């Protein structure tokens, strides 16, 4: 079962928030694809 990425804090850069969006999409892909 994949490791959930932590949301950045209040002071995050757009770089950190966009990186988070990609990590969250990767996590949710692993969650939804795992059983196949």
């Amino acid at each position: 079962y994949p490791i959930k990425p932590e949301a950045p804090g209040e002071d995050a850069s757009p770089e950190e928030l966009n990186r988070y969006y990609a990590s969250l999409r990767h996590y949710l892909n692993l969650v939804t694809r795992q059983r196949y």
Epitope: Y1, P2, L30, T32, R33, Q34, R35, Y36
Partner: antibody, heavy 111, light 108 residues
């Protein structure tokens, strides 16, 4: 991304074969890994699966007494250990994980 | 065990046709359904998972719908490479059983 199968071929009834499936291109713990077979001219039949993140296994109870699924995370390899093979086990055996299928290997069980 | 009933077992159709294959689970599988295409002497190809999600590189003319026990695969406009055998498979609880398959052949 590929699953590459090895180990099929001809075995006498009551004999043993080990199939293997080498995965490449992604983290080996991402997806459950399944074995599926297809007798000549027939449909797909689900055999077993393993979760490489924790070794959890499911078996088609039809094969539970005779077949053992395993993997080695340090080799990116899935195994199926088939004991006490019978003529009715003649089939193409596939490994499958998410969108990735092995090429299949023909296992013939005959005298 | 949950069994999958696929219909029809064979379909004669033409390039351009809209076609539908159905798959009914004997128990609730939520959306844990995959569709596969298989051609003679080839490994199955994974088309759709979670009932409706297209796998990478699969053409948009393939669509899946369903939830619970009632599922369907639709091809909006058959192309020559679409004549093949189709199977559904559930991933709810083991055994992860397949439909018995639909053979999609060319009408003449």
């Amino acid at each position: 991304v590929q699953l590459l199968e090895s180990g099929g071929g001809l075995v006498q009834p009551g004999g043993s074969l080990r199939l293997s499936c080498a995965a490449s291109g992604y983290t080996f713990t991402n997806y459950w890994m399944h074995w599926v077979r297809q007798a000549p001219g027939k449909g797909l039949e689900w055999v077993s699966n393993i979760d490489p993140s924790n070794g959890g296994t499911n078996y088609n109870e039809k094969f539970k007494s005779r077949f053992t699924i395993s993997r080695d995370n340090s080799k990116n390899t899935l195994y199926l250990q088939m004991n006490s093979l019978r003529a009715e086990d003649t089939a193409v055996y596939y490994c499958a994980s998410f969108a990735y299928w092995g090429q299949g290997t023909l296992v013939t069980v005959s005298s | 065990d949950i069994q999958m009933t696929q219909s029809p077992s064979s379909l004669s159709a033409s390039v351009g046709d809209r076609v539908t294959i159905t798959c009914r689970a004997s128990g609730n599988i939520h959306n844990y359904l995959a569709w596969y295409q298989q051609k003679p002497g080839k490994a199955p190809k994974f088309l759709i998972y979670n009932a409706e999600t297209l796998s990478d590189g699969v053409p948009s003319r393939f669509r899946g719908s369903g939830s619970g026990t009632d599922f369907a695969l639709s091809i909006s406009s058959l192309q020559p490479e679409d004549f093949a055998t189709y199977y559904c498979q559930h991933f709810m609880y083991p055994p992860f059983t397949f439909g018995q398959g639909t053979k999609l052949e060319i009408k003449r």
